[PDB]
């Protein structure tokens, strides 16, 4: 059996607090869907 990863597999890339900002990172994440 298989399923569709429904918006999963994203983790906090580091330990820095950020707010009200969009931050771009490249690392090993599970792709959406």
């Amino acid at each position: 059996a298989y399923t569709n990863s429904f918006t999963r597999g994203v983790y906090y890339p580091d330990k820095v607090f950020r707010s009200s900002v969009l931050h771009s990172t490249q690392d090993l994440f599970l792709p959406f869907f």
Partner: protein, 50 residues
Amino acid sequence: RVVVLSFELLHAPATVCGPKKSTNLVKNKCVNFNFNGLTGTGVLTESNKK
């Protein structure tokens, strides 16, 4: 005999700090601060961030 000391520079709560003694903290004044080795100058105020 060789020992290599690998340092993770700061990104998380620090636990291994040098013999430099801490000082008291003064708020709402322009100060030259050093927090866990990260240095800079500015005024420290209370905040409501989490």
